[PDB]
């Protein structure tokens, strides 16, 4: 039931994800080292981690079918408002539910609830973020559904500042129909609808997590001693 257009969209997104995600986490060696034990000892390391992730999300977004047809202003708008959500989505690949942490190779590069707190964030964000990672991990998504959810997350028409909302909607509709057909090719009803309904609910939870992170990022970045430890890309992308 998967068309040739839908099969090509899936192959491109999987190719894009494989090019923009290194499961070896070798590039973590070049970040500023993590300090677990002034009080925000994990801010430098996690700032480089987010800065690195933003670059990967931009590269992945550029390879989404139809993304380049947008104007530069719309590409910037979609990426500024979705980068935080895609980072939380793509981080699920390293999330393990043994200790509720992101395991990326070593114990140096294994981050838990305390590690996020050593970056300036309260549990008003960390607790819903952990709940999100568990509920997302329990969905047991294929890599095809994972990459389609990331592309649908990026190409959203209801982002503030979007110029050609109809064009963004038309691109998202093709990615959504590709996702709905893939779920039907793998799961009979009514489980197919229940899976797709939970996936869209995760996109709604991302908007809530986006608002909470933005609230705390503004509080942290307003302090010059904290924004001094950020990266130029983070200040440009997360700053508005």
């Amino acid at each position: 039931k998967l068309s040739e257009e839908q099969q090509h969209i899936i192959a491109i997104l999987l190719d894009a994800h494989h090019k923009t995600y290194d499961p070896t986490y070798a590039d973590f060696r070049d970040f500023r080292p993590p300090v677990r034990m002034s009080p925000l000892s994990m801010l430098p390391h996690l700032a480089d981690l987010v800065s690195y992730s933003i670059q990967k999300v931009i590269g992945f977004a550029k390879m989404i079918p139809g993304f380049r047809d947008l104007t530069s202003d719309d590409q910037i708008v979609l990426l500024k408002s979705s980068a935080i959500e895609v980072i939380m989505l793509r981080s699920n690949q390293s999330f393990t539910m043994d200790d509720m942490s992101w395991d990326c190779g070593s114990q140096d590069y294994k981050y838990d609830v305390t590690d996020v707190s050593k970056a300036g964030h309260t549990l008003e964000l960390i607790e819903p973020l952990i709940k999100f990672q568990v509920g997302l991990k329990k969905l047991n998504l294929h890599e095809e559904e994972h990459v389609l959810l990331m592309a649908i997350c990026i190409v959203s028409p209801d982002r503030p500042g979007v110029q050609d909302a109809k064009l963004v909607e038309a691109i998202q509709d093709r990615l959504s129909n590709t996702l709905q057909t893939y779920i039907r090719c793998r799961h009979p009803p009514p489980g197919s609808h229940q899976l797709y309904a939970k996936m869209i609910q995760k996109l709604a939870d991302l908007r809530s997590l986006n608002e909470e992170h933005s609230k705390q990022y503004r509080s942290l970045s307003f302090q010059p001693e904290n924004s001094m430890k950020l990266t130029p890309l983070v200040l440009e992308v997360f700053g508005n």
């Binding site: 670059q55 931009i58 590269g59 550029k62 530069s72 590409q75 910037i76 990426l79 500024k80 130029p232 890309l233 440009e236 992308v237 700053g239 508005n240």
Partner: peptide, 11 residues
């Protein structure tokens, strides 16, 4: 504001 680093990463 302008986003020169974002634009450079967007080819």
């Amino acid at each position: 504001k302008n986003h020169p680093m974002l634009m450079n990463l967007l080819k």
